[PDB]
Amino acid sequence: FITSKIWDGALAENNHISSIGNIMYTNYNVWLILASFILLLAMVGAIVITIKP
């Protein structure tokens, strides 16, 4: 494998966590909403089946 540099592409590089953050809340935020509902359901579900009311 061979690699070289670019300059226009490297003007302000993001770390991977910043590249994810760029799109995670705006372009693909439906996934984030869906995941929150799964986390919500997991929280309420695991509590309801294990503890005395």
Partner: protein, 87 residues
């Protein structure tokens, strides 16, 4: 290719297991990690942050599913006292 071998290991967990249902949960976690490992390496080869984002949601969902399954197992153990199948 490592991800393939890991998926086999998780698959073989069910094949080699008649009585240990705790190993059943672990095999599901190995398979999920194997599939996530494969997505992550492919998205590095294809220069795609969406693949990394997909991995993050699988981790979240796998974590949430482990929470539910451990909860269901606890509701089962409370009435039974064993996690062992009499086979």
């Amino acid at each position: 290719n490592i991800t393939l071998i890991l998926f086999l290991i998780g698959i073989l967990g069910f094949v080699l297991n008649r009585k240990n249902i705790i190993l059943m949960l672990i095999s599901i976690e190995i398979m999920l990690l194997s599939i996530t490992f494969l997505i992550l390496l492919s998205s590095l080869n294809m220069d795609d942050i969406i693949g990394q984002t997909y991995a993050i949601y699988i981790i979240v969902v796998a974590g949430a599913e482990s929470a539910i399954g451990l909860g269901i197992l606890v509701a089962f153990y409370r009435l039974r006292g064993s996690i062992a199948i009499e086979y």
